[PDB]
């Protein structure tokens, strides 16, 4: 009658072992266990699923096993890729039910390894309006967090992760914008926040 | 496709009311239900229903549900009094237990004041020649700014054909004043191309953001353009160095 999820988000770097921890309490014995993921605009569906005590069940690299002397069903991958970053829900239906019990669900994010950083933030002008701009914070590793401003009239991104075949092109970003007419880049990704070797040409 | 959900969104005003019609495709997973997920992405069970005629009501937080089995093939929702929003899912299985569960495409509600809702502007800003110098890439910028409520989905067209790769969209839009419970919102998108595809003026790039509004059922009576679903887009052509 019920399904826990203990972790709500897990922040991972590409490359490195994912598991995500599910467990669950039933008085049945036709007990089916279930992992669905949930990308961006898309609906769950499926990941993987099984009703068979320790037999390794898998799917496009993720694979879980039950275990039910420990009441278990662990979702696991070996190497997380970008593409991988979704919600992950663990699901529990008996026979006894109509529902399906889902648990609360898990954040999977995968961030990318940047091999070659090159940190810099630019400034675009818009293509129809040569007043208003753009500052684009790129290029930085992982580790380099983008804190939200605490001015009101400057707003700031989160950094998105570019996932690129390319390993030139895979990169992370963040943008900031203001209409005030005092607004610099500078004002919003500051000296104390950017890498001390990061690109900052003069507009 | 094994289900058909309608409609994809609503804007429902409080204390109304919204009809939700999931019809089925294939005979072989006559088992429908319906679920919702709330704002904090639980999802929960509300009604499986499965012979014609079956009729159940059920509150929730937020909603009151009545939820009718019109057909082997039709499954209805009455979504009332609504005070918070939600998705809903219909859902179909071969059997009532130990099958897999297939997800519809989803209706999202959203409950809030209809004359504060407001298209996104759109603006796309063209990639510096510092990062061009720099990296011999270059980032071209999209901005949807003014929005509310915060269902826009965004795209990107290269030479009038969708692209993904190369695309990098916020996953979550920002609120431009986060103390307000009724903020607008702002969405910001990159498109990162060799430094040489931007540097064509052959090459032609727009961001498009399509917007969830109004109904056209729902009467506007205000003096500025009434705010339904719409597409609104930016664009820029390719700049030779």
């Known amino acids: 009658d019920s399904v826990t999820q203990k972790e709500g988000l897990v922040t991972l770097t590409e490359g490195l072992p994912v598991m995500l921890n599910c467990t669950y309490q039933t008085i049945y014995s036709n007990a089916f266990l279930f992992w669905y993921v949930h990308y961006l605009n898309e609906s769950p569906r499926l990941l993987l699923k099984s009703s068979t005590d320790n037999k390794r069940t898998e799917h496009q690299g993720f694979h879980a096993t039950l275990h039910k002397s420990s009441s278990s069903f662990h979702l696991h991958k070996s190497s997380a890729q970008l593409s991988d970053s979704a919600l992950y829900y663990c699901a529990l239906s008996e026979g006894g039910n109509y529902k399906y019990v889902f648990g609360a669900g898990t954040r999977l994010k995968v961030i990318a390894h940047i091999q070659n950083p090159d940190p810099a933030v630019y400034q675009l002008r818009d293509s129809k309006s040569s007043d208003k701009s753009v500052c684009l914070f790129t290029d930085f590793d992982s580790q380099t967090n983008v804190s939200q401003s605490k001015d009101s009239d400057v707003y700031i991104t989160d950094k998105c992760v570019l996932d690129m075949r390319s390993m030139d092109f895979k990169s992370n970003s963040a943008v900031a914008w203001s209409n005030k007419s005092d607004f610099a880049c500078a004002n919003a990704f500051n000296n104390s926040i950017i890498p001390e070797d990061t690109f900052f040409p003069s507009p | 496709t094994l289900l058909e959900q309608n409609p994809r969104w609503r804007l429902v005003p409080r204390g109304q009311a919204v009809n939700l019609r999931c019809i089925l495709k294939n005979s072989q997973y006559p088992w429908m239900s319906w679920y919702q997920q709330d704002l904090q992405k639980q999802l929960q069970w509300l009604f499986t229903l499965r012979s014609p005629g079956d009729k159940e009501v059920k509150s929730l937080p937020g909603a009151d549900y009545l939820a009718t089995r019109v057909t082997d093939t039709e499954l209805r929702l009455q979504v009332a009094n609504m005070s918070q929003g939600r998705t809903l899912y219909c859902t179909c299985?071969?059997?009532?237990?130990?099958?897999?569960?297939?997800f519809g495409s989803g209706t999202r509600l959203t409950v809030l004041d209809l004359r504060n809702v407001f298209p996104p502007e759109v603006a796309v800003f063209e990639p510096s020649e510092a990062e061009i110098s720099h990296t011999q890439k270059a980032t071209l910028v999209c901005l949807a700014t003014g929005f509310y409520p915060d269902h826009v989905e965004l795209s990107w067209w290269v030479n009038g054909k969708e692209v993904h790769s190369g695309v990098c969209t916020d996953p979550q839009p920002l609120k431009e004043q986060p103390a307000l419970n009724d903020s607008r919102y702002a969405l910001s998108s990159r498109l990162r191309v060799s430094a040489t595809f931007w540097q064509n003026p052959r090459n032609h790039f727009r961001c498009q953001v399509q917007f969830y509004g109004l109904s056209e059922n729902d009467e506007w009576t205000q003096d500025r353009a009434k705010p339904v679903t719409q597409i609104v887009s930016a664009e820029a052509w390719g700049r030779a160095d």
């Open positions: 299985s071969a059997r009532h237990s130990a099958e897999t569960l297939y």
